């Protein structure tokens, strides 16, 4: 249980890196909506950033959230520099996908998936 760290010795430094990455994304979202000329609003993209950060809000391992900050910086670097196109940025917004059945009964109606 003695493991070699990545960047963070414990979870406080890890949350510091999560917090700085969130600051960087929050600053970037208006530029992304402008230069990719997205059809979303800045508040909507910021809600998507908050959704992506709250998706990983259960992690208690410092190395795992170090890798999450690293991959978030890689996503940010692909978005600031125009390496992604408009399609890669809009793949966060699952727009052409049909709304999946949520409760038991509609999932029972359409098929066999639990």
């Amino acid at each position: 249980t003695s493991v070699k760290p990545i960047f963070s010795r414990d979870m406080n430094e890890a949350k510091r890196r999560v917090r700085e990455l969130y600051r960087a994304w929050y600053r970037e979202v208006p530029n992304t909506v402008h230069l990719f000329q997205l059809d979303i609003s800045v508040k909507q993209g910021r809600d998507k950033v908050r959704e992506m950060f709250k998706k990983n809000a259960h992690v208690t391992d410092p190395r795992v959230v170090d890798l999450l900050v690293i991959k978030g910086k890689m996503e940010l670097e692909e978005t600031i520099n125009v390496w992604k196109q408009r399609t890669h940025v809009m793949r966060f917004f699952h727009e052409t996908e049909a709304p999946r059945p949520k409760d038991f009964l509609s999932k029972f109606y359409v098929g066999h998936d639990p």
Binding site: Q37, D39, T96, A98, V110, G111, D113
Partner: protein, 297 residues
């Protein structure tokens, strides 16, 4: 229910939706997005086309292999209509014109061809027929469009009594002739009140009318969330577009206000959230670029 038309899969491109649709008028503005939203479910779409097959190319990426069948048809030929509808379980009628031509006038486009399609679908055992009228269709209207379209609504109802007649108000989208008309007109301001509706809302409503058995024999009125005056709507279109082919029938229809029929169901009785103009006006009018939102009533 036959075994090949039982739905399967997770509702994707290679899935089976159990919807076998013949979409008359599928090469137009509404038929584009309807064949789009049908073929992403895994539906067998039948496209009778009048036009050059080059003009149906954009429909081929819209579904899986063998799921869009193209075939020739003529509006005055019942044999081709029968050859198109005899295997479908839903026929959607989208045949329309903004202008009348040398061969097909407003009566042929809105009365003759819709009643022929509905009658031939009736005698071919097609369970569902979905006809598209206009919201402002009236026998006593000033435009020949709306008179013939109200007469065709009447005939489609009395020859296919379980049909789902739908009343879009003024559909706006990328390929519309509502916001793209105002962006290019560069006619005047009057007492007209309109509530335009987004094309994805209309398409989701037509598909939710296909799926809901409670839409048989009904008449829906597809309207947007917000009623606008005509003048500040046109000024909002010129403000979004960063701006400072017509006929008198189109002028009669622009200066015809959208009637409100609360006795008819709408998009919310099909479970569709009506998208306002302020979200999608930039998506429509970004092409016209080389904003305070519009005042509702």
């Amino acid at each position: 229910l036959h075994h090949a038309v039982i739905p399967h899969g997770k509702g994707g491109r290679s899935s089976v939706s159990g919807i076998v649709a013949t979409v008359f008028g599928a090469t137009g503005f509404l038929g584009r997005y309807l064949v789009n939203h049908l073929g992403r479910m895994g539906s067998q779409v039948i496209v009778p086309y009048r036009c050059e097959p080059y003009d149906t190319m954009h429909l081929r990426p819209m579904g899986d292999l063998g799921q869009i069948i193209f075939m020739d048809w003529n509006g005055r030929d019942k044999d081709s209509i029968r050859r198109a509808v005899e295997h479908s379980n839903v026929v959607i009628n989208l045949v329309g014109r903004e202008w009348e031509t040398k061969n097909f006038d407003f009566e042929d486009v809105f009365v003759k061809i819709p009643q022929a399609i509905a009658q031939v679908s009736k005698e071919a055992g097609v369970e569902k027929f979905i006809h598209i009228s206009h919201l402002n269709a009236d026998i006593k209207s000033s435009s020949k469009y709306l008179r013939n379209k109200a007469v065709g609504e009447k005939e489609v109802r009395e020859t296919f009594p379980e049909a789902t007649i739908i009343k879009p108000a003024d559909i706006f989208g990328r390929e519309d002739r509502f916001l793209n008309y105002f962006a290019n007109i560069r006619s005047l301001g009057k007492k007209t009140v309109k509530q335009p509706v987004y094309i994805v809302d209309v398409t989701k409503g037509i598909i939710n009318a296909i799926k809901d058995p409670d839409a048989r024999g009904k008449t829906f009125a597809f309207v947007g969330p917000n009623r606008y005056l005509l003048f500040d709507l046109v000024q909002y279109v010129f403000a979004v577009a960063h701006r400072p082919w017509t006929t008198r029938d189109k002028v009669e229809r622009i200066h015809t206000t959208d009637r409100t029929l609360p006795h008819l169901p709408g998009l919310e009785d099909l479970g569709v959230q009506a998208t306002p103009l302020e979200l999608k006006a930039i998506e429509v009018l970004r092409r016209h670029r080389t904003v305070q939102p519009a005042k509702t009533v």
